[PDB]
Amino acid sequence: DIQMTQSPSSLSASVGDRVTITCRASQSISTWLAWYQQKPGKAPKLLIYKASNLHTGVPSRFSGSGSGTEFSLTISGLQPDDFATYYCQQYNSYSRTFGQGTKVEIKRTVAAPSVFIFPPSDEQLKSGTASVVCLLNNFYPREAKVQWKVDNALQSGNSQESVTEQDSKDSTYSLSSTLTLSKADYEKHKVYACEVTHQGLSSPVTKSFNRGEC
């Protein structure tokens, strides 16, 4: 089949900027390419078709170019509501394949996360299970590493992570990782540390606690 490949997969821009997103076909598709916008929790909307024709109603700050293999969407003078995900779709064949997406995010200053760690509650520890929680709070670039350690010993397969979308106030992200263990395992050990690596930190920050003594 014809595969579509969008670049970059994410992009950071400020309002007023001019940004260009790329779409490449693994084989030729003439000019039969369409571009769509999608904001979160909403249906997509057509922006461009024919690989350069503007749909009715679509602002003229969007423009598309290309043919055969290489295509391009350009947005000049980003407005606040152009931060969204953009998809391409080829319609040269019946498979009607779309690209994976390009997310246009808002650009912002570097910001280290404030990091907190939470032991499991006495109420859960009744239930026979036990969850420890790390929180990274208000940081820019979304990229970070989070490492659980138990009695100073590395954990894997044992945790799940979750990130919020960009804050509408200060354009930061927050992240939480939950380390889930059985009660019997938990009661065995003492130091539950949370180690965090991130660009705004000149070195990795650790928050820890010892079960039994505050």
Partner 1 sequence: EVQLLESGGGLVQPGGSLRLSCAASGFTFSHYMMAWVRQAPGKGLEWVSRIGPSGGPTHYADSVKGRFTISRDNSKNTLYLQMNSLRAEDTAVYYCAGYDSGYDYVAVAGPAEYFQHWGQGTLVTVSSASTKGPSVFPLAPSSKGGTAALGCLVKDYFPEPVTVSWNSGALTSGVHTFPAVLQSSGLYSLSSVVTVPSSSLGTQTYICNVNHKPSNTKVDKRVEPKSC
Partner 2 sequence: QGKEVVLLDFAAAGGELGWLTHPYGKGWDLMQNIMNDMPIYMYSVCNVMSGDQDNWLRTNWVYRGEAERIFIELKFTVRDCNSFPGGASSCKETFNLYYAESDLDYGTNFQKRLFTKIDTIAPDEITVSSDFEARHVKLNVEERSVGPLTRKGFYLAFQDIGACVALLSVRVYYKK
| Interface residue list for partner 1 (CB under 8 A) | 30, 32, 34, 36, 38, 42-46, 49-50, 53, 55-56, 87, 89-101, 114, 116, 118-121, 123-124, 127, 131, 133, 135, 137, 160-164, 174, 176, 178, 214
Minimum CB separation of residue 52 from partner 2 in Å reads: 8
Please state, in angstroms and as integers, the Cα–Cα distance from residue 117 to each residue in 19, 29, 164, 177, following that order.
Answer: 39, 52, 18, 10
User: Residue 37, exposed/middle/buried by CB under 10 A (0-12, 13-18, 19+)?
Assistant: buried
**Element (DSSP H or E) covering residue 85:** strand 85-90
Q: Is 72 in the site for partner 2 (CB under 8 A)?
A: no
Choice between 16 and 41, CB closer to partner 1: 41
Given 30, 127, 182, 197, the residue binding partner 2 (CB under 8 A):
30
Q: Is 31 in the site for partner 2 (CB under 8 A)?
A: yes
* Three-class secondary structure of residue 187 per DSSP: helix
| Number of chain residues interacting with partner 2 (CB under 8 A) | 4
The β-bridge partners of 149 are 154, 193
CA distance 23 to 71: 5
- Residue 86, C-beta contacts closer than 8 angstroms, at least 6 positions apart: 6, 21, 35, 36, 37, 38, 47, 73, 101, 102, 103, 104
Query: Pick from partner 1, partner 2, none: which does 42 bind, CB < 5 to 8 A by kind?
Result: partner 1
Minimum CB separation of residue 73 from partner 2 in Å reads: 15
Minimum CB separation of residue 127 from partner 1 in Å reads: 7
Choice between 57 and 212, CB closer to partner 2: 57
Minimum CB separation of residue 50 from partner 2 in Å reads: 8
CA distance 135 to 149: 15
**Element (DSSP H or E) covering residue 91:** none
Which residue in the block uniquely carries the two structure tokens 């889930």? 180
Minimum CB separation of residue 31 from partner 2 in Å reads: 5
Could you say which residues in the range 37-66 bind partner 2, by CB under 8 A? Answer: 52, 56
CA distance 32 to 89: 8
Q: Is 155 in the site for partner 2 (CB under 8 A)?
A: no
Choice between 56 and 109, CB closer to partner 2: 56
Minimum CB separation of residue 39 from partner 1 in Å reads: 12
Footprint of partner 2 (CB under 8 A): 30-31, 52, 56
